């Protein structure tokens, strides 16, 4: 069915706008919005279709004190959207309280596109973790759309703040938002700034204007992850069947992402599979290993070569991973997109459950604990104190993510007959 | 190939959800005008509407299952097919016998499209603390999706690619019919419409999964509104699933790639032999 | 074909066998029938053809039909069938399109007879629709004078609800006759004449055109009972115009007598209130059994409609019920 | 028969003039009035036909202290009309008393075009609710033409004043005029300013000059609603048969209006029906649902596709409405008009009885009640006090519209065997 996307945060609104720019380049529309007669493709799961010849993308544009949204206005894509949902803090708790006081009218904006379409499948949350304006508010609406509708699917697009230590309040914020993503979202697509910055410094020569480049990298990822849904495949071409294969344990819903062209600014399948398994073509940063991998192909692919290629990785002993179930590596095939200039014809995807990211989590679980011993880096905001007078909800969230780390460490081994 | 071999999946993911609740009921409880409108629909809403031939497709039933290749209380999950009718110059190649062989392939594939979406639909109903049913559900859904892909890109698509080369080299119509017959024989023989028992082990395999879906959703809705009498049925279903799996692997190992499917089903090589053969 | 379509104007005649006979022009038919109602409610022994011809001239040059060819409007003329001593103008009336030239070779008396039969069908329905819009007109006119009597509210409201299902029935039959009995057939005729290069093709196309009209209309041999059912739902249409008026010939007049009694004052009225308690139950119990009779005959139509032709008549079944009223009270 | 239109109010006179401009573009006449030989169509139900080659539209032009009528004079359509009926308050009661004192000569103007034509069918009232000059006077003449002629039909074109709260006397005025429309009109075509303003802001970029655009939207609606009468169809091509199908209950005569081209500044029938049922292509703003719908089509329409399309809505479960009678959804077909540039060839209509508008009514029934508690917003006009010394006629009108709301709430349910 149809999928509604919601973007908040300034960085989130930017990457949502660039994503819709990428899809306007993808789909049979002009940059004004008007249909082009050159075109197979479906424009229904992400675009509301009138006959106003300007098919409006199904995005909910919410903000706090619009600054970059003015720059979103000065563009030729100002005729692509106008659903009139633009409305005028610093912490998780302050942003949570500010989202608390105005919940009725933003939820009326949600109920508007809920009543606008008749079929409903999923909500994509475009959000940055511990981002200030995004944090607190995004966790609040995440709690509310899961509590209000238990029949739909919740997916999230999320980056990870990592700068190798400055914001001293970030481990509290990420800790609480990770609780809310684990208990109020069914699947989370995890990215970080650091690995994409590393790959960007690898391909280009960039130090200062990194943001403008990594946005392009992210948008290529999010378009690629939706090519199987927008163009009709037969495997996991709905969101529900896609997420139903990727979760072996209901606490594990974090998906690793890669992309086989590391630079785009002939091939057989075993080549791109082996290039795919390398950690440098991976976009997300003791024995730590995958539980189950799904890889998705896009290009001119002969069908018998994929069988030989999977046989090749079986013979390589590149499978030095060992979970406790026979749920295995997964191949899928979709077409490369027509209708646009398409360089580097065959390109890959991976969607995998990897426990190396738990190290990333425990770094936050390290940092907050140190600040919890010092008690000088909570910054003592007034709404933060009124919202929780004892600050034991952060301690309870630390307990939940500690159980999450123990369940990860049990999921690494082939012994999960007992709970971890 | 667009409707039988599923070359438009948006048609199916719309049609199945809008059609299963009327389709599920027993024989002589369904009326054909209702289903004809719902079919004409999911064609006209989908982008499978672009081809010039979209009204040759009609719905009929097979009340007689795989028995006919040498039902009475259910229909639409045991009596369901599409017939794509033929004109006079096109009935020289694709005639009645080819259409029946295509239909008896498509009927066996309808069950593998059916059971996977039952598992995926019971997954979303629930997104110490009994969780062994999750392991069984995940094992079955991984199994049936791997079986589906293996049929999709091992048999159907490569021989269709071969047919696209063979029919462009034809010089008389006795080469066209010969290529079509060889295509039909290879695609029917390589799939699971061939053994002296015609693989009833696979029918029982999918039967215990539809029983698993049914019992698990009936228990979870009643619990939401014993816990060890419910455990015994799942343990029995797990035992039967493993037993029939070892039976399928034994019946493939006796007849000499084709050991392909095992290499995908167990990437690690676990459960690869839990009982020696002969 | 070329000389017949210009020197005898064969095609312009064929355009005027749909407009007039099969009601394809439609405004001339309603403007003729509004002015001919007091004549036709009389017995037709006191009706003569010159009085039809004269009012026909008003209808023709008041309406659009004046701008078409003098030949085809000249060929429209009235006709009257043979009389009986028991007679009604609605029973004996016809429009006859004359056939002049050698056009008799293309159109025989048998196709005229079937033309007259379908005209009789669309004659009955086009009368009963006028009677029902008089029912709605009486509801909208009398009730805003009946704002000083709330004791009639039950029986007037019951007559209001009884009107509306008749409006639904005589608003789904008259699209079953439009978009399937005069439009799909018109498409197949206009295709098979304009491509055809022989007179033997165009005659044999009009033949199957007209026989399909006999099959799609309810005038076949086997659908006779169906028609005899359908006549029964026209019965309770025309009956209603008397019964509704049987309200106002007692209700509305007493209110004027009451206003004159009030203007006198600037012992009698207790009997006027009591005779209402004598009158209201009888008219209520009459309207109730008329209601139940009408529901029973339309449900007995709908159960008979299921066993019919495979596709053509079955479409009508869908037309008569879209809400499953006859599948919630069955 | 012939239909006479009467326009009052400055806004009403403007939209009547624009409507006659639209019909002069429609009909075979020039902007001077002179016949053009390019032309099927009937110019008799709205245009008096002399042989003065300037066919005079059957409009009665009444006013109070003409200001915008001078702007009506400076136009090339000043030779289209001159029936000499232009004659020189603030409330409903003051305007009612001012209409009371001059009733003889304006009713002589009415009797003039009544004796001018021999056949008479209906009176269209072009009027704005609580509009000042229109209010009071329009209700007075509404009472008088229904009291004088009970054999004709009364239709009204009316907009609803809504500004989301400024005029403090508007709920009294709209309350009284709604009583007069319910008891002195047989059918009312209801519009509001707010939904058309919303659709206008959707299609264009307009904030200040909204009036000039919404007039065009209204005129397109009123021309479309008359295309079945001006061009000979066979279903409801008179006013009487049209209104006889739309009223299931004599208190309910308010018609919902939509238009399938939301912007005009290929198609099959199921597409425009499904686009038609959407609330965004609707022009008028617990379970609330239609009683009976009539939809009218204008365009190149194949006859068998409409049957399939109606079957499609039957299969969609877009019929989540349930009144107490089998009176059902209604399709009708008329032609698209020749003789003018016709873009967006297939266009739709709806004429439907919907109870959501009762919420709009009770907002007025809320507001007046609050002011009735305060007693400082009646503004105490002298003719208002002399016309009603106790102001109990507003209380009686509140009682009547309360019974109207109860009858609406009974009509929503499938249980109307008892009176509500």
Curated annotation (Swiss-Prot), chains A, D:
Q: How the protein assembles, per its UniProt entry?
A: Component of the gamma-tubulin ring complex (gTuRC) consisting of TUBGCP2, TUBGCP3, TUBGCP4, TUBGCP5 and TUBGCP6 and gamma-tubulin TUBG1 or TUBG2. TUBGCP2, TUBGCP3, TUBGCP4, TUBGCP5 and TUBGCP6 assemble in a 5:5:2:1:1 stoichiometry; each is associated with a gamma-tubulin, thereby arranging 14 gamma-tubulins in a helical manner. Gamma-tubulin at the first position is blocked by TUBGCP3 at the last position, allowing 13 protafilaments to grow into a microtubule.
Function summary: Tubulin is the major constituent of microtubules, protein filaments consisting of alpha- and beta-tubulin heterodimers. Gamma-tubulin is a key component of the gamma-tubulin ring complex (gTuRC) which mediates microtubule nucleation. The gTuRC regulates the minus-end nucleation of alpha-beta tubulin heterodimers that grow into microtubule protafilaments, a critical step in centrosome duplication and spindle formation.
- Organism, by scientific name, is Homo sapiens (Human)
Looking at the UniProt entry, the stretches that span the membrane are none
Could you say which protein family the record assigns here? Belongs to the tubulin family.
GO terms for MF: GTP binding; identical protein binding; microtubule nucleator activity; structural constituent of cytoskeleton
**Keywords, in A-Z order:** Cytoplasm, Cytoskeleton, Disease variant, GTP-binding, Lissencephaly, Microtubule, Nucleotide-binding, Phosphoprotein
Principal location listed in the UniProt entry: cytoplasm
Which parts of the sequence carry Phosphoserine? 119
- Write down what this protein is called: Tubulin gamma-1 chain
Effect on the protein of changing residue 360 to P: In CDCBM4; the chaperonin-dependent folding and hence the yield of monomeric gamma-tubulin is compromised
Q: Which GO terms describe its cellular component?
A: apical part of cell; cell leading edge; centriole; centrosome; ciliary basal body; condensed nuclear chromosome; cytoplasm; cytoplasmic microtubule
Compartmental location: Cytoplasm, Cytoskeleton, Microtubule organizing center, Centrosome; Cytoplasm, Cytoskeleton, Spindle
Q: Which residues bind GTP?
A: 130-136
From Swiss-Prot, chain B:
Question: So which tissues is this one expressed in?
Answer: Ubiquitously expressed.
Where in the cell does this protein reside?
Cytoplasm, Cytoskeleton, Microtubule organizing center, Centrosome
The disorder on record is: Cortical dysplasia, complex, with other brain malformations 15: An autosomal recessive disorder characterized by global developmental delay, variably impaired intellectual development, speech delay, facial dysmorphism, microcephaly, and varying degrees of cortical malformations including pachygyria, thin corpus callosum and subcortical band heterotopia. Most patients have generalized seizures.
Question: What family does this chain come from, according to its entry?
Answer: Belongs to the TUBGCP family.
What is known about what this protein does?
A: Component of the gamma-tubulin ring complex (gTuRC) which mediates microtubule nucleation. The gTuRC regulates the minus-end nucleation of alpha-beta tubulin heterodimers that grow into microtubule protafilaments, a critical step in centrosome duplication and spindle formation. Plays a role in neuronal migration.
Quaternary arrangement and interactors, per the entry? Answer: Component of the gamma-tubulin ring complex (gTuRC) consisting of TUBGCP2, TUBGCP3, TUBGCP4, TUBGCP5 and TUBGCP6 and gamma-tubulin TUBG1 or TUBG2. TUBGCP2, TUBGCP3, TUBGCP4, TUBGCP5 and TUBGCP6 assemble in a 5:5:2:1:1 stoichiometry; each is associated with a gamma-tubulin, thereby arranging 14 gamma-tubulins in a helical manner. Gamma-tubulin at the first position is blocked by TUBGCP3 at the last position, allowing 13 protafilaments to grow into a microtubule.
Protein name, as recorded: Gamma-tubulin complex component 2
| Range of the intact protein held here | 517 to 872 of 902
Swiss-Prot record, chain C:
According to its UniProt record, in which tissues is this protein expressed?
A: Ubiquitously expressed.
Q: Which residues cross the membrane?
A: none
Q: Where in the cell is it found?
A: Cytoplasm, Cytoskeleton, Microtubule organizing center, Centrosome
- Oligomeric and partner information: Component of the gamma-tubulin ring complex (gTuRC) consisting of TUBGCP2, TUBGCP3, TUBGCP4, TUBGCP5 and TUBGCP6 and gamma-tubulin TUBG1 or TUBG2. TUBGCP2, TUBGCP3, TUBGCP4, TUBGCP5 and TUBGCP6 assemble in a 5:5:2:1:1 stoichiometry; each is associated with a gamma-tubulin, thereby arranging 14 gamma-tubulins in a helical manner. Gamma-tubulin at the first position is blocked by TUBGCP3 at the last position, allowing 13 protafilaments to grow into a microtubule.
Membership in a protein family: Belongs to the TUBGCP family.
**Described function:** Component of the gamma-tubulin ring complex (gTuRC) which mediates microtubule nucleation. The gTuRC regulates the minus-end nucleation of alpha-beta tubulin heterodimers that grow into microtubule protafilaments, a critical step in centrosome duplication and spindle formation.
Name-wise, this protein is: Gamma-tubulin complex component 3
Species of origin reads Homo sapiens
Of the intact sequence, the residues represented are 546 to 890 of 907
């Amino acid at each position: 069915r149809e999928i509604i996307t919601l973007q908040l945060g300034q960085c989130g609104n930017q990457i949502g706008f660039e994503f819709w720019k990428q899809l306007c380049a993808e789909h049979g529309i002009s940059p004004e919005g008007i249909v082009e007669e050159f075109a197979t493709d479906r424009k229904d799961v992400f675009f509301y279709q009138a006959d106003d010849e300007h098919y409006i993308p199904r995005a909910v544009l919410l903000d706090l004190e619009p600054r970059v949204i003015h720059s979103i206005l000065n563009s030729p894509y100002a005729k692509l959207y106008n659903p009139e949902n633009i409305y005028l803090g610093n912490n998780w708790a302050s942003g949570f309280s500010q989202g608390e006081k105005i919940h009725e009218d933003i939820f009326d904006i949600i109920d508007r596109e809920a009543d606008g379409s008749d079929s409903l499948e999923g909500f994509v949350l475009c959000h940055s973790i511990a981002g200030g304006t995004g944090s607190g508010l995004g966790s609040y609406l995440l709690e509310r759309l899961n509590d209000r509708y238990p029949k739909k699917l919740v997916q999230t697009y999320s980056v990870f703040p990592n700068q190798d230590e400055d914001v001293v309040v970030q481990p509290y914020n990420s800790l609480l938002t990770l609780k809310r993503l684990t208990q109020n979202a069914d699947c989370v697509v995890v990215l970080d700034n650091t690995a994409l910055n590393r790959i960007a410094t690898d391909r280009l020569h960039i130090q200062n204007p990194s943001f403008s480049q990594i946005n392009q990298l992210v948008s290529t990822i999010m378009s690629a992850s939706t090519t199987t849904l927008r163009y009709p495949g037969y495997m996991n071409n709905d969101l529900i069947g896609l997420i139903a294969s990727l979760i072996p344990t209901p606490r594990l819903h974090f998906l690793m992402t890669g992309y086989t062209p590391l630079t785009t600014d002939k091939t057989t399948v075993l080549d791109v599979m082996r290039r795919l398994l390398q950690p440098k073509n991976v976009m997300v940063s003791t024995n730590h290993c995958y539980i189950a991998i799904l890889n998705i192909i896009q290009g001119e692919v002969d069908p018998t070569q994929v069988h030989k290629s999977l046989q090749r990785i079986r013979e390589r002993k590149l499978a030095n991973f060992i979970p406790w179930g026979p749920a295995s590596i997964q191949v899928a095939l979709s077409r490369k997109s027509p209708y646009l200039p398409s360089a580097h014809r065959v390109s890959g995807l991976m969607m995998a459950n990897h426990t190396s990211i738990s190290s990333l989590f425990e770094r936050t679980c390290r940092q907050y604990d140190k600040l919890r011993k010092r008690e000088a880096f909570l910054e003592q905001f007034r709404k933060e104190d009124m919202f929780k007078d004892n600050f034991d909800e952060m301690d309870t969230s630390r307990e939940i993510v500690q159980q999450l780390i123990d369940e990860y460490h049990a999921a690494t081994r082939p012994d999960y007959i007992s709970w971890g | 190939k667009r409707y039988f071999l599923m070359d438009q999946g948006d048609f199916f993911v719309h049609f199945m959800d809008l059609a299963e609740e009327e389709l599920r009921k027993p024989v002589e409880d369904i009326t054909p005008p209702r289903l004809e409108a719902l079919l004409e629909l999911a064609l006209r809403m989908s982008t499978a509407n672009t081809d010039p031939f979209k009204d040759d497709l009609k719905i009929d039933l097979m009340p007689h299952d795989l028995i006919t290749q040498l039902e009475l209380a259910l229909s639409g999950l045991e009596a369901f097919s599409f017939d794509y009718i033929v004109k006079w110059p096109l009935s020289l190649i694709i005639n009645r016998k080819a259409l029946t062989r295509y239909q008896m392939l498509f009927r066996h594939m309808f069950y593998c499209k059916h059971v996977e979406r039952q598992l995926c639909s019971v997954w979303i109903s629930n997104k110490q603390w009994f969780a062994g049913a999750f392991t069984l559900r995940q094992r079955m859904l991984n199994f049936v999706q791997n079986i589906q892909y293996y049929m999709m890109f091992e048999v159907m698509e490569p021989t269709w690619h071969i047919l696209e080369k063979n029919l462009k080299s034809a010089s008389n119509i006795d080469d066209v019919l010969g290529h079509h017959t060889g295509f039909l024989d290879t695609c029917l023989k390589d799939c699971m419409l061939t053994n002296p028992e015609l693989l009833k082990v696979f029918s029982k395999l999918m039967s215990v999964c539809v029983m698993f879906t049914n019992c698990m959703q009936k228990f979870t809705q009643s619990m939401k509104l014993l816990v060890s009498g419910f455990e015994a049925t799942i343990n029995k279903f797990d035992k039967n699933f493993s037993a029939h799996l070892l039976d399928l692997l034994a019946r493939l190992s006796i007849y000499s790639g084709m050991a392909s499917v095992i290499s995908r089903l167990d990437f690690n090589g676990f459960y690869t032999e839990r009982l020696e053969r002969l | 074909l070329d000389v017949l379509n210009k020197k005898y104007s064969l095609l312009d005649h064929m355009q005027a066998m749909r407009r007039y006979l099969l009601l394809g022009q439609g405004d001339f038919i309603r403007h003729l029938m509004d002015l001919l109602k007091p004549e036709l409610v009389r017995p037709a022994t006191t009706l003569y053809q010159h009085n039809l011809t004269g009012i026909l001239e008003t209808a023709v040059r008041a309406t659009n039909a004046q701008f078409d060819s003098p030949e085809i409007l000249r060929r429209l003329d009235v006709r009257l069938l043979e009389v009986s001593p028991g007679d009604t103008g609605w029973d004996v009336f016809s429009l006859d399109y004359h056939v002049d030239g050698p056009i008799a070779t293309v159109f025989t008396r048998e196709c005229m007879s079937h033309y007259l039969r379908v005209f009789n069908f669309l004659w009955r329905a086009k009368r009963m629709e006028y009677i029902l819009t008089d029912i709605r007109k009486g509801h909208m006119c009398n009730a805003k004078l009946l704002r000083n009597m709330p004791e009639f509210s039950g029986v007037l409201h019951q007559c209001h609800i009884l009107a509306s299902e008749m409006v639904h029935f005589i608003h789904q039959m008259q699209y079953y006759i439009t978009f399937e009995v005069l439009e799909c057939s018109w498409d197949e005729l206009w295709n098979k004449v304009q491509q055809a290069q022989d007179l033997d093709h165009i005659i044999a196309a009009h033949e199957v055109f007209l026989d399909t009209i006999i099959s799609r209309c309810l005038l076949d041999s086997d659908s006779r009972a169906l028609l005899n059912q359908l006549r029964a739902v026209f019965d309770q249409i025309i009956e209603l115009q008397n019964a509704q008026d049987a309200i106002y010939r007692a209700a509305l007049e007493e209110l004027q007598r009451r206003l004159q009694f009030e203007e006198k004052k600037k012992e009698e009225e207790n009997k006027r209130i009591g005779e209402f308690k004598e009158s209201i139950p009888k008219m209520c119990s009459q309207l109730r059994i008329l209601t139940h009779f009408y529901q029973g005959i339309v449900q007995q139509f709908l159960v008979l409609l299921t066993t019919s032709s495979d596709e053509s008549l079955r479409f009508l079944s869908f037309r008569l019920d879209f809400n499953e009223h006859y599948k919630a009270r069955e």
